[PDB]
Write a protein that binds this ligand. Structure first.
Ligand code: CL
Ligand code: CL
Ligand code: CL
Ligand code: CL
Ligand code: CL
Ligand code: CL
Lengths: 141, 130, 141, 130
C-alpha cells in the first residue's frame, strides 16, 4: 500500500485567535487547514517545495476529505500534525493525518484525504512521478 | 427540499480561480443553521435550552468547481436522528445550472452548553424533524 | 467630493460560527470581509456585477484599509453594512462604511478604504469609467 | 528588531495569485502574540492575571504583493504604552529580499477578562516594554 515509520514526520503549529470559534476552541473546519499545511511541509522536506512542483508541472487536488474530531484544542495550544501516505495509486495518493496537542499528545483530529496528481497547466490527470513515489518512503531519488 | 442560497466572494476563492475546497464545509454549516432556524431553532432557542451542537465527523466529496460570484444552493437533509446526535446529508449545487459541486456528510453531537457533556436531543427538536 | 443619501444602501448579513473567535464575538478582522462583500453588492446594484467588471477590464484593488471597532456582535446577529463613496478621484475612490447590528442599529465597526481602479489584464492604473462615476450618485448611465 | 517568520499557504491566497489583503492583518496579529510570548506574556500568563487584549483600531497600507510559498518577516514594535492601552507599529516584509509588503498600525485596549471592562496595563507588562 505505502509504508511509514522512522522518526515520523510531524509539523508543529500554534493556535491563534483566527483559528478559534465562539466555543473557545479551534473551529472544526480549521483542522483541515492545519492538515493541508502539513502535507505542504512534508512535500517540502522530501524535495518538493512549491517552485519544484510548478517546475515539474505538478499540482495536487483534493477529491475527498474526511475528519473525525476527538478532543478540543484551545487558544495558544501547539499542535503536532502528521502527513502519512496510506496508499499510493498511479495518479493519486491517500493521506492519513493526525492532529495532536503538543503538551500531552492527546489526539484532537484524524483526517483522511484522497489527493489527485494533475497537470498544473491543463488540470488533466497524470502519473505521480517516480522520484515522488520513492520519496514517500525514502528519497536519495 | 430545503435549499439555502449563497454568493461566492473573493474571500472564498483561491489561486486556482475557484472556491477553496475547505470553504464548502463553511457553506454547508451555514445551511444547517438556516434549516434549524426555519424549523424554529435559532441560536437564542438553543442557548435558552442549554443546547450546543458540535461536529464529531465531517466528510466531503468534491465533484466540479465554483468560481467568483457564482451563487450556490445548499441542502441540509437530516438522514438520522439518534438520542444524543443527528446525521446530515448535504449537497452544494451551482444555482445557475444545478451542477453538483460537493457532497457532504456530518455527524453532529448534542451537548450541554454549560459543561460540554453529551445530552439527549430535546423532544421538540426530534419532533421538528421526525 | 462624492454625494450620498436617498434610501441609503445597506447589505444584510448573518454572523455564523466561522466569523467568531474565542471571545464569543465576531473576530475583528472579519468585519473587513463583511465590508468588502458590501462594496461588491453595491457595485452589483449599480450595474457592475463581476461579469460586467471583467467585461470592461476593470479590477478594484485595496491600497489602504482602516477600521475602528466600537461594540461587539455575537453569534447569529444580523449585520447591516453600508458602502458609501466619500471621495471620487480619477483612478481611485475612498469608501466609508458602517457595520451596524440589525436588531438595534448600534454601530459595531467603521471602516475607510482607499480603492484603486486598474486594468484587469495588466494591473496598471486606469480612470474610473464615466458610467461608474455616475452610478455613485444615480445611474440611468 | 524582533521579527517573526511565517510561510504563505494556499489558504492565504486569492484569485489574483497573491495573499488576500485582509490576511496581512492576521499575520500581524500572530507577530504581536509572539512578541508578547518572548517578553514573558504567553496566553496562560494573561488569563492568569485576568487580562484580555482587544483591537480598538486597525490600519493597513499595502505596498507590494506576496505569493504562494513566500516567507514573511513581521515586526511588532510598541510605539506607545498608555494606561489602559498600547499602540503597535508593524511591517510585513518578504523574507527573501526584504521588500516592504504591508504596514500596519493598531491601538490595542487592555480589559478585564471576566467583565470586559477597561483596566490598567499591569506594571510588569509596562516594564517589559518601557
Ligand atoms: Cl486538507
Ligand atoms: Cl524543493
Ligand atoms: Cl468518503
Ligand atoms: Cl475590506
Ligand atoms: Cl452587472
Ligand atoms: Cl492610513
Amino acid at each position: 500500500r505505502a509504508q511509514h515509520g522512522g522518526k515520523p514526520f510531524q509539523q508543529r503549529f500554534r493556535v491563534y485567535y483566527e483559528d478559534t470559534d465562539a466555543g473557545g476552541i479551534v473551529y472544526y473546519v480549521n483542522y483541515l487547514k492545519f492538515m493541508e499545511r502539513a502535507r505542504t511541509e512534508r512535500l517540502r522536506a522530501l524535495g518538493f517545495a512549491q517552485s519544484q512542483l510548478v517546475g515539474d508541472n505538478l499540482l495536487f487536488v483534493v477529491h475527498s476529505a474526511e475528519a473525525r474530531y476527538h478532543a478540543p484544542a484551545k487558544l495558544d495550544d501547539e499542535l503536532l500534525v502528521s502527513a502519512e501516505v496510506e496508499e499510493l495509486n498511479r495518479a493519486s495518493l491517500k493521506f492519513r493525518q493526525q492532529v495532536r496537542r503538543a503538551s500531552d499528545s492527546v489526539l484532537l483530529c484524524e483526517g483522511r484525504f484522497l489527493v489527485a496528481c494533475v497537470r498544473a497547466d491543463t488540470l488533466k490527470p497524470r502519473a505521480i512521478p517516480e522520484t515522488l513515489r520513492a520519496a514517500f518512503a525514502g528519497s536519495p531519488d
